[PDB]
Write a structure and sequence with these properties.
alpha/beta, transmembrane (chains A, B), globular, binds the ligand O=C(O)CC[C@H](NP(=O)(O)OCCC[C@H](NC(=O)CC[C@H](NC(=O)CCCCCNC(=O)c1ccc(F)cc1)C(=O)O)C(=O)O)C(=O)O, Transcription Elongation Factor S-II, Chain A, seven-stranded mixed beta sheet, 21 helices, homodimer, binds a molecule of 3 linked components (NAG-NAG-BMA), Ac-Asp-Glu binding (chains A, B), cell membrane (chains A, B), binds a molecule of 5 linked components (NAG-NAG-BMA-MAN-MAN), binds a molecule of 3 linked components (NAG-NAG-FUC), 36% helix, four-stranded antiparallel beta sheet
Chain lengths: 694, 694
């Protein structure tokens, strides 16, 4: 039989391993020749595997690179202008890679050039609340200072925006052992911790979903009109550079000024974590100097787009996409994901060669320039937005398949909750102590939901990956899954070797997944989800799951507002309309579910499948959220404080955030009421798409 | 048989006549009790006629009314402040209506209050080019002057915007006999000309598609958040009032200052048409004073929405809509249209009672507050935009069925050209001298197309009626048809009694259409178009007709740019990308037409019908046109100089308009190139929706 079980059994751990090894032997930085060659290899292999068509889709987008003959570095400079300490020019390469060419040295992509000199201020994680604490409570002024911030907690682009708004003239990012060194584990290559010379690369843009900084709204094709650099979207105004903890210790150890306000500001280095500004007595005359010479350059990027045409509904697309570009070797991010995509294509292709076709069209994507701001996925979605708007059933992401070896992690729209629960009950747990049990069982035991008791945790989507344009701009149901760590017992951020030269094939094979069984489980989850979305007669979305979460979010946002009962009385601020809308959605969703169960009629089916497909679409507001025209989903958006986090009822949440500090409360509360109306109206409008159509 | 011929034969001239008489015996001003009562009558009758459901959809929107105890008027005031001449407080009522209550006196809806005094400047039609002529050529400064403008040529709201931008402190609008009195015909009631005491009512907003001024983007429902009046969309900043030509003559006869620049500035009154400013020698000390006391008031309005559910595709909507609110009796505008809609409903209902249903759902609408800025249609479309976006097949408008008795007039998307040609070849001409000939034959002979020789004229759509939100905002294929005058041999504007108390049932029955045969022909055209759109197996849209017009428009916009060959060389301005896109659209459209002809498969059909339905939708840009976010169609928009006119490639056209007068040519030509790219990209994106889907 050609059923989901045939697809699943054809997937092999050994194949994922070989593909990962193949994809990680040299760097594949976006816009380089090696990543173009990798794109052409993937194109050829997907054709061999049996896809109907496989093309490259190219764009010319703004990228950023260090100058090879003018290296970036940071100094401590004395009174006489002698540079008495210098940060490293490269990470010491791992065993056996000491002769590998074209490893990009650590840098902050899209940093402007500059050589600012000044006194340091230490800003913890550079979060909105860290800057509140500095200015409002500690009375420390960042204006004209160089800020040093530890990585972790929030997207690094938000840290830079926060520093810029505080008046900083430069930012230094560093990896603290508190956040990147788990106690009792060795530094790479003897364990999976970040060594003192390790550095996290990464872009520091604030694109808010725009894609290529020069062409917001439109694909960066051959005839595209480009903004001038001064009008580009999301570029930082001050120089930024990342360092490791050996170098950070040299910069932090001399710090004077005010003590850290509390223990939450102290990392694990043997320094006091003084906030500054500047250095203690003996060293007060020394300054910090940055030297940044990176350049931004319009560069060609290449997506691979594979098509497996549906037999019955070829005009309905289920997309499996993940990126291919990496900072260096991409041992986890993204090649552990790309290897899984490759095996999934190979397996679908095996069935296709035996005469099988999915009901709906499956599109497979290898995205380029994800690391430079989701550029490849966003430009292709801008080029194809009308096809995606009217035909896009679901997007399943496929970046890093592992960030740990503890349990499953799923983040997705409520419309996929039931699909994921059902699929994971049919898959085998790969976990020790759960042999013969379902993945649902081990996942639910290890990762209980804090929102719904007895259920597994499923998180929200924000941004920081290639699902963003599909979900937040276009309103196509989206999800993602990977294996993860125990977040409850580990204090470290993400996985420690993220974006460092040490994130290699050996890291994965030796420490994370030697038998490739977690990769195989993730291939089954991602692949199974795609299979069901592309083959199930009735789309496997349950609108009732959206109703239950809308009520949780409505309760949550009301509870935030209710911290201000006097102002809600004064300005007549009522959530009644939102709760009414959510109640109506619950009622209508229930009736629609009844009809869905109670109908041989392919027009009623497809009419109903269209109602299911356009339900996520109904949460889009074509006017977008305030000052963020490419975040158009009213229920979810990436947090304005941290693009990685998904916020619910984001329009109301931002209207309420820090409201007590607004100079004109009547105007501020008016805008909260405006956002309640937009949210209530959108929830009711989405509900009505599920009503009988005539 | 229940076929189009059964539907058409059931329509009766005598029924249209009786409904028109019924709808025009009292005024039905938007927001008044009489128009609510009319709405409830129509609701009841549509149910009786056999529709499946008929509901009222109400909204609370900003309307504007004179103050009943503080009348609007204009004076000539002497030095001592004595008002020596006063304009009329009402139009003398027509025979037999001298006791009719609730006739609103002439006023400009949404005028602010004020009593400005000053010197007059005469500005011809107050068009952009009239103001260019005054400032640039004649060196006449309107700043602080009261402007007097003749009605005609462009939407009155554009005249007011132009006057405001020129610095005027008030505007007087008047009807010149040159534009509202055809030589050789008598004034009402003895003929169809405007008498000297006749005045045209009408709103002077500049909404640019927003709908209710207080709630742009969202329906004005019970919980809606409203903008404060100071933030409202489109309200004029200076007082405005309309007068007739007896009163205009008193204001114009004393005018001094500069002579009219040429004969195109002279109307037909026995005055010199001096431009001013101010009056001749003896009268130089006299001024003009306006007294405007109208108030804007949020008021409830009621649409009637009738549903005739489709038997096969109930989730595909064909909409027949026109307004019901009138300035006074609405003898032509809109009741000659509403009576035709009523007979069309009655006929569809006759077939429904015999067991027939259309393939697709037909929605019938009686819109309220059209005269106050398309408010009823726009608020309902804002409430229902997600249903309309994904299910809306076509909108057919149904305002005034006649503005003359000479030949057919059709304005519509190119996607309906072939539908209209085919339908009119099957209908009988009602014209004298064409008995036994088709409507296509008489129409083509009387109204030859200036764009395609041998074909009948079909115009573009701009705004100024209820199709605007459907076509320009949402991208749903739209069209309209009515009987019209010979435009070639008549100099007058529209029909002369437009928006006056004299536009009555008797005007229509005595002068325009005594046998109601033109109304019947229009009922057949509108009704037949709806029938075909709702019943044809394959949607009756021909994408090849769009290809031919896109090339005409591309030629046209290139020819405008080519008046500036030096600048096109200097700034490297190329239309190659647009022509390439149009060539590709032509090619793809041809192949799609082949496939459409060459496919028992309801999924291929519906897939193909979806491609046809979403083709108009593909021309929408979700970012909208510059500073007009609710005009989103890239091929057509209402002219920025005249909302009644449709402009092609409006983004490029506005970027080129008056470009030689721009201070920074590099920036201006850059924006032309930007608009070429947006247009080329959109044309190619629309083309690709017609490609094989996978
Ligand atoms: C959740 O779903 C429910 C439906 O189950 C919606 O209920 C609607 O709620 C609105 C707003 O509260 C009601 O609005 C009121 O309508 C009255 C007229 O209703 C008649 O006409 C409609 C159709 O045209 C029929 O459906 C209806 O049964 C009646 O025949 C108005 O007269 C009301 O205005 C008066 O009262 C208000 C409040 O005091 C005053 O402000 C006004 O000035 C005026 O005096 C009012 O506009 C609507 O009738 C309800 N529809 C129903 C019950 O079918 C909720 O709206 C929905 N939630 C959300 C968020 O959308
Ligand atoms: C009307 O429809 C036609 C198709 O019939 C479109 O033609 C495309 O036009 C573009 C832009 O001119 C061509 O772009 C060029 O692509 C080359 C690579 O093409 C290869 O890969 C693609 C798929 O990935 C294949 O389809 C293709 O056959 C090849 O295998 C690039 O190398 C070109 O860049 C080089 O030249 C340009 C121009 O000098 C330089 O600026 C660059 O720096 C570089 O040196 C270029 O990008 C595209 O190949 C065409 N597709 C075809 C023929 O199938 C038109 O675009 C379309 N009109 C509009 C308005 O969209
Ligand atoms: O330009 C861009 O937009 C991004 C470019 C690039 N993208 P990427 O490097 O390819 O990927 C981004 C990596 C960061 C991302 N981070 C997150 O998804 C975590 C964000 C975090 N979210 C959360 O903390 C809540 C959601 C996860 C909950 C997970 N916990 C469990 O699954 C779990 C819980 C308990 C337990 F016992 C077991 C498991 C936050 O809010 O900051 C990730 O890991 O993929 C980049 O970020 O530089
Ligand atoms: O708020 C609003 O947006 C509008 C509210 C209200 N709307 P309405 O009063 O209910 O309706 C608007 C009336 C004005 C509109 N005017 C037009 O459609 C003409 C506009 C005109 N358009 C044209 O000149 C080109 C299109 C018509 C071509 C017609 N010619 C023939 O059909 C023809 C030609 C030759 C021939 F020998 C025979 C016939 C222009 O550009 O200004 C109409 O008649 O419906 C209002 O305008 O106050
Ligand atoms: C996830 O799996 C659950 C449990 O298997 C799916 O729910 C089940 O769906 C079936 C098929 O529609 C329902 O069967 C129906 O039963 C009623 C009689 O009660 C009958 O009227 C229908 O003809 C049909 O046989 C079944 O009740 C339902 N079970 C539940 C809700 O407990 C669920 O649909 C799956 N979710 C997906 C695929 O997204
Ligand atoms: C308006 O009326 C015209 C003329 O009747 C319609 O065009 C005609 O459409 C028919 C039906 O699809 C075409 O018939 C086809 O002929 C070819 C053989 O040449 C065959 O392959 C098909 O099986 C089918 O029998 C016919 O050629 C065509 N005539 C033309 C273009 O001159 C047109 O579709 C109507 N437009 C509408 C309804 O929007
Ligand atoms: C810290 O570095 C500076 C700069 O050195 C240059 O840049 C490095 C990236 C690397 O490419 C070096 O080879 C370059 O010389 C050092 O200061 C320089 O020292 C040289 C030689 O003594 C002198 O002629 C230059 O003028 C100096 N440049 C500057 C900007 O001062 C400095 O010695 C290093 N400090 C330490 C403690 O190692
Ligand atoms: C022009 O009208 C003014 C104002 O008259 C008032 O408003 C009219 C709409 C109507 O309602 C009249 O009955 C009102 O009196 C006339 O000037 C007024 O004259 C009265 C009586 O003589 C005097 O007491 C008021 O002060 C005047 N008001 C003003 C504003 O001047 C004026 O006579 C009329 N001129 C002509 C030539 O008819
Ligand atoms: C990754 O795998 C690919 C696919 O097998 C290898 O590419 C092939 O290499 C052989 C020998 O050089 C060529 O003859 C084929 O044309 C290649 N096939 C392609 C590109 O599709 C590639 O060598 C592997 N890379 C590494 C680093 O192991
Ligand atoms: C990268 O840095 C190099 C080295 O400093 C730059 O090359 C110099 O550029 C100047 C003029 O801009 C020349 O006169 C020098 O001869 C160059 N020096 C060397 C060693 O080649 C180069 O411009 C930078 N690249 C960028 C900014 O893209
Ligand atoms: C317009 O026609 C309607 C429909 O016939 C008339 O309304 C009816 O009037 C009778 C007698 O007063 C009532 O008993 C019915 O209930 C009405 N039917 C409705 C409202 O659906 C109305 O009188 C006519 N108006 C004019 C001015 O002739
Ligand atoms: C319409 O005009 C009337 C008449 O001038 C206004 O009524 C007057 O309002 C003032 C205070 O605003 C009262 O003191 C007077 O007694 C009123 N006069 C009369 C004759 O009633 C009324 O306000 C206006 N209506 C509006 C602006 O909506
Ligand atoms: C911080 O420092 C600068 C002076 O260089 C000043 O302009 C700025 O307003 C200061 N901010 C505060 C809050 O003191
Ligand atoms: C793999 O799992 C083991 C056993 O729980 C654990 O000790 C180890 O830290 C895990 N490795 C990684 C890289 O998370
Ligand atoms: C018109 O008049 C006013 C003076 O009241 C002046 O400010 C304005 O700039 C003048 N415009 C021109 C073009 O002279
Ligand atoms: C009706 O048609 C006749 C004959 O052509 C013409 O003389 C008359 O002016 C027309 N009436 C109107 C109102 O256009
Ligand atoms: Ca872009
Ligand atoms: Ca509105
Ligand atoms: Cl992922
Ligand atoms: Cl019309
Ligand atoms: Zn990644
Ligand atoms: Zn990454
Ligand atoms: Zn009208
Ligand atoms: Zn009108």
């Amino acid at each position: 039989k050609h059923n989901m079980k045939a697809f699943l059994d054809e997937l092999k751990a050994e194949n994922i391993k070989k593909f990962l090894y193949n994809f990680t032997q040299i760097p594949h930085l976006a816009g380089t020749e090696q990543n173009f060659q990798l794109a052409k290899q993937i194109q050829s292999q997907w054709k061999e595997f049996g896809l109907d068509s496989v093309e490259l889709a190219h764009y010319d987008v703004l990228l950023s690179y260090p100058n090879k003959t003018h290296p970036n570095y940071i100094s401590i400079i004395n009174e006489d202008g002698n540079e008495i300490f210098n940060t490293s020019l490269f990470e010491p390469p791992p065993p056996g890679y000491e002769n590998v060419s074209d490893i990009v040295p650590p840098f902050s992509a899209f940093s402007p050039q500059g050589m600012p000199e000044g006194d340091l201020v230490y800003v913890n994680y550079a979060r909105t609340e860290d800057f509140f604490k500095l200015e409002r409570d500690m009375k420390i002024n960042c204006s004209g200072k160089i800020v040093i911030a530890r990585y972790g907690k929030v997207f690094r682009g938000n840290k830079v925006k926060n520093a810029q708004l505080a008046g900083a003239k430069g930012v230094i990012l560093y990896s603290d052992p508190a956040d990147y060194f788990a106690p009792g584990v060795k530094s790479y290559p003897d364990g999976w911790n970040l060594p003192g010379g390790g550095v996290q690369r990464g872009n520091i843009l604030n694109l808010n979903g725009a894609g290529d900084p020069l062409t917001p709204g439109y694909p960066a094709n051959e005839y595209a009109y480009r903004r001038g650099i001064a009008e580009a979207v999301g570029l930082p105004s001050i120089p930024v550079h990342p360092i490791g903890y050996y170098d950070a210790q040299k910069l932090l150890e001399k710090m004077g000024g005010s003590a850290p306000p509390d223990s939450s500001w102290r990392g694990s280095l043997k320094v006091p974590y003084n906030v500054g500004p500047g250095f203690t007595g003996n060293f007060s005359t020394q300054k910090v100097k940055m030297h940044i010479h990176s350049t931004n350059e319009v560069t060609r990027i290449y997506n691979v787009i594979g098509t497996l045409r549906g037999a019955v509904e070829p005009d309905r697309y289920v997309i499996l996409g993940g990126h291919r570009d990496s900072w260096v070797f991409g041992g986890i991010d993204p090649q552990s994901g790309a290897a899984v995509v490759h095996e999934i294509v190979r397996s679908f292709g095996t069935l296709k060669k035996e005469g099988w076709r999915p009901r709906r069209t499956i599109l497979f994507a290898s995205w380029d320039a994800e690391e430079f701001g989701l550029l490849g996925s966003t430009e292709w979605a801008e080029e194809n937005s009308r096809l995606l708007q009217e035909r896009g059933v679901a997007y399943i992401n496929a970046d890093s398949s592992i960030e740990g070896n503890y349990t499953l992690r799923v983040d997705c729209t409520p419309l996929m909750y039931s699909l994921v629960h059902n699929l994971t009950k049919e898959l085998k747990s790969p976990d020790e102590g759960f042999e013969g049990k379902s993945l649902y069982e081990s996942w639910t035991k290890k990762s209980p939901s804090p929102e719904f008791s007895g259920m597994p945790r499923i998180s929200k989507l924000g941004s920081g990956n290639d699902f963003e344009v599909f979900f937040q701009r276009l309103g196509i149901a989206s999800g993602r899954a990977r294996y993860t760590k125990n977040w409850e017992t580990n204090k470290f951020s993400g996985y420690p070797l993220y974006h460092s030269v040490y994130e290699t094939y050996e890291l994965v094979e030796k420490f994370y997944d030697p038998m490739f069984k977690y990769h195989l489980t993730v291939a089954q989850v991602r692949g199974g989800m795609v299979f069901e979305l592309a083959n199930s007669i009735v789309l496997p979305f349950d609108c009732r799951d959206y109703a239950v979460v809308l009520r949780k979010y409505a309760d949550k946002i009301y509870s935030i507002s209710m911290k201000h009962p006097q102002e809600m009385k004064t300005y007549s601020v009522s959530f009644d309309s939102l709760f009414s809308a959510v109640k109506n959605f619950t009622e209508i969703a229930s009736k629609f579910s009844e009809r869905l169960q109670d109908f041989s009629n392919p027009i009623v089916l497809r009419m109903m499948n269209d109602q299911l497909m356009f339900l996520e679409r109904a949460f889009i507001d074509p006017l977008g959220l305030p000052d963020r025209p490419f975040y158009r989903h009213v229920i979810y958006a990436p947090s304005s404080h941290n693009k990685y986090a998904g916020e619910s009822f984001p329009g109301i949440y931002d209207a309420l955030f820090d409201i007590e500090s607004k100079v004109d409360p009547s105007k501020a509360w008016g805008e909260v009421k405006r956002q309640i109306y937009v949210a209530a109206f959108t929830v009711q409008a989405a509900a009505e798409t599920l009503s009988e159509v005539a």
